[PDB]
């Protein structure tokens, strides 16, 4: 056929070792750009004035960091939410001082990861699958949007986006607790239920299927050779697994329907992480965790502290120390 | 339905940003100050206070070397200093009388700040859109006393949540509509499994 | 999509046991160390550089300042048996806050 | 930076010793039968 038809046929081909697709034509260049800039910056970028106070923070390995302390540092508070591409800087030296790499990386990453999700829809369609793996992926994806884009928008600066680094991540978490009391927010609590529960049900399902593998091997070989890729029969006895778990708790607390079971495995962590993402995305607009500071009062009016008041003392320590040279006025309003 | 769900998700995200930043069709008289507004109002409040005490706020150097009250934006405009440097795009009727061609005007700051501007800045600084889910107004470490969460926070948070779930609903129904139109929304035909007719990847 | 995929269902489900179970076991070992205050608190090379060079700053040194605030501001009420009295002037605080 | 001078050989043997263990076992599996 014509060259455009052949090109379209290759792009959407189900026979490519890695599927490309139309989402892929955006995903591949954007993710390569973000990856290459990230790696180069992580190794070699000079210090970045994250808080706009001419106090540059060193993030790269060559400038004194190890793997745990290193980061790509968010762009300057003086930029705020302004779009700061390379061509807006007078020079690369200026671009680097002000944290230009961070914006390039997170914007290419967020676009590429959004296309990764669309690409999961697209291949499922080409293969004749049902379509909702991409909906499961929307939960981690929404969480990345929350910490790299929505929280900066609500606070008015990409300098408050999560840094691209291990210790920078912890910095973001501690400051977030000081300013939003996230631990006391029910959407973060649902998030914890989601990931604790996800890990629990992962171990549970793994242990139950492994416990009921049908004997197909000898004592001196891995039991994994008892399963052959593409065999039609199930490789474990779900009736035995349910017979075990239903007696562990009680019969009606156990799944006998594999489709119901696996739907539950999908839904529990996905919904929980959706609420995690929505916690960050709504604390982005300063609707914060529950505040019970001085909620308990005695007959005279003395404050009777609760554990919430002890949390408050810890939060205060974080608040008064963070960004120790950046505040001139008494209230931290963003 | 899936097309409309995508449209409504987009509109919800837009409305979230409208109520968070815009103070024209969401007048601050009715909705409270925006986040940027209240932060600018704090800087205005202590500029007024310290200048009344005798400070020359144009030449006051802060701890970092930047002006404690006034500094330049990255393109040179005179703007409020401190963390509110991020909010210099803010515009509001209580502040614009102090703005000249190059930004905030020192002569207007020295001579022309009216009592109603001091009042409005104090009001907005102390009704910043920060507060707890049980409606304790202020920063997260503030004690109980003030029953306040800004309408801007209620409207922004609610509509982000709804916009997000409507994006999820769009993906759900768009993917399902495609699968149903093509005839495999109920699963793979065992006797006609498409991958079994494809060449191996390796 | 991802480049690799499971092909053995028995391996897949063993891996689902292995990953969270091993993670919790590792976290338990760290807490046994913290029982003795045997922390991963510092990077000595970072502290030596920062002590001599007041322009050197990383996210690691920023988080220690947060920790110092947490300790000083929470300890008097969180550890009442110590009878801590920290005068206002000794409390660590940045500017204004 | 004043790093621990044993960190380099600690890291090198940490990688090399178990990696070569696995490579030895892999290659002698391929060469069987």
């Amino acid at each position: 056929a014509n060259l455009w038809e052949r090109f379209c046929n290759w792009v959407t081909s189900t026979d490519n070792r890695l599927y490309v697709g139309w989402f892929g034509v955006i995903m591949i260049p954007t993710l390569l750009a973000a990856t290459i800039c990230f790696v180069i910056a992580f190794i070699a970028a000079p210090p970045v004035d994250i808080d706009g106070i001419r106090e540059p923070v060193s993030g790269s390995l060559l400038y004194g960091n190890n793997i745990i302390t290193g980061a790509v540092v968010p762009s300057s508070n003086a930029i705020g939410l302004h779009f700061y591409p390379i061509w807006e800087a007078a020079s690369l030296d200026e671009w680097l001082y002000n944290g230009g790499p961070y914006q390039l990386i997170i914007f290419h990453f967020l676009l590429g990861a959004s296309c990764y999700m669309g690409r999961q829809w697209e291949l499922s369609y080409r293969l004749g699958m049902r379509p909702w793996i991409c909906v499961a992926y929307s939960a981690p994806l929404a969480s990345a949007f929350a910490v790299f884009l929505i929280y900066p928008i609500g606070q008015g600066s990409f300098s408050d986006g999560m840094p691209l680094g291990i210790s920078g991540t912890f910095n973001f978490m501690i400051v977030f607790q000081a300013e939003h009391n996230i631990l006391m927010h029910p959407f973060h609590q649902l998030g914890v239920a989601g990931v604790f529960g996800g890990a629990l049900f992962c171990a549970m399902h793994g242990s139950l299927v492994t416990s009921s593998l049908i004997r197909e091997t000898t004592e001196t070989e891995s039991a994994n050779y008892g399963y052959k890729f593409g065999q039609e029969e199930e490789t474990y006895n779900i009736v035995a697994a349910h017979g075990y778990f239903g007696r562990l708790i009680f019969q009606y607390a156990s799944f006998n329907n594999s489709r119901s079971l696996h739907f539950f495995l999908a839904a529990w962590p996905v919904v929980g992480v959706w609420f995690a993402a929505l916690g960050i995305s709504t604390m982005a607009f300063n609707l914060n965790g529950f505040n019970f500071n001085h909620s308990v009062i005695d007959a005279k009016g003395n404050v009777i502290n609760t554990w919430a008041d002890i949390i408050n003392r810890a939060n205060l320590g974080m608040e008064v120390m963070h960004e120790r040279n950046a505040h001139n006025f008494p209230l931290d309003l963003a | 339905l899936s097309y409309s769900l995508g449209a409504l998700s987009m509109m919800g995200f837009i409305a979230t940003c409208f109520v968070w930043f815009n103070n024209t069709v969401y007048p601050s008289e009715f909705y409270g100050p925006t986040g940027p507004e209240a932060s600018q109002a704090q800087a205005m409040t202590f500029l007024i206070r310290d200048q009344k005490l005798g400070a020359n706020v144009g030449s006051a150097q802060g701890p970092t070397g930047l002006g404690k009250y006034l500094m330049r934006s990255p393109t040179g405009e005179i703007i409020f200093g401190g963390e509110t440097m991020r909010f210099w795009d803010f515009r509001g009727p209580w502040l614009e009388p102090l703005r000249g061609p190059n930004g905030l005007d020192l002569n207007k700051i020295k001579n022309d700040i009216q009592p109603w501007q001091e009042r409005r800045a104090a009001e907005y600084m102390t009704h910043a859109p920060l507060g707890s889910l049980n409606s304790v107004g202020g920063v997260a470490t503030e004690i109980n006393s003030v029953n306040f969460v800004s309408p801007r926070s209620w409207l922004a948070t609610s509509h982000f949540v709804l916009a997000f779930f409507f994006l999820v609903g769009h993906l759900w129904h768009a993917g399902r509509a495609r699968a149903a139109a093509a005839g495999f929304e109920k699963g793979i035909d065992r006797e006609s499994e498409p991958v079994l007719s494809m060449p191996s990847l390796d | 999509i991802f480049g690799i995929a499971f092909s053995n269902k028995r391996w897949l489900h063993f891996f689902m046991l292995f990953v969270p179970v091993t993670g919790l076991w590792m976290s338990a070992i760290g807490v046994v160390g913290l029982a003795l205050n045997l922390r991963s608190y510092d990077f000595i090379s970072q502290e030596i550089r920062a002590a001599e060079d007041p322009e050197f700053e990383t996210f690691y040194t920023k988080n220690l300042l947060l920790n110092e605030g947490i300790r000083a501001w929470m300890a008097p009420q969180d550890q009442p048996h110590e009878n801590f009295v920290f005068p206002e002037e000794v409390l660590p605080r940045g500017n204004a806050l | 930076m004043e790093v621990n001078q044993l960190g380099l050989i600690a890291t090198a043997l940490f990688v090399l010793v178990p990696s070569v263990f696995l490579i030895i076992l892999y290659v002698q599996t391929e060469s069987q039968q």
């Binding site: 390995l61 | 390796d202 | - | 380099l8």
Partner: peptide
């Protein structure tokens, strides 16, 4: 030497990805 070590380990991991993907043991229906 630290930076070389960190970047070396990272480079080995990326090479491992390449082999794990393009030179995997091929899945075969038995």
């Amino acid at each position: 030497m630290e930076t070389i070590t960190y970047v070396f380990i990272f480079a080995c991991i990326i090479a491992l990805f390449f082999f794990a993907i393009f030179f995997r043991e091929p899945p075969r229906i038995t």
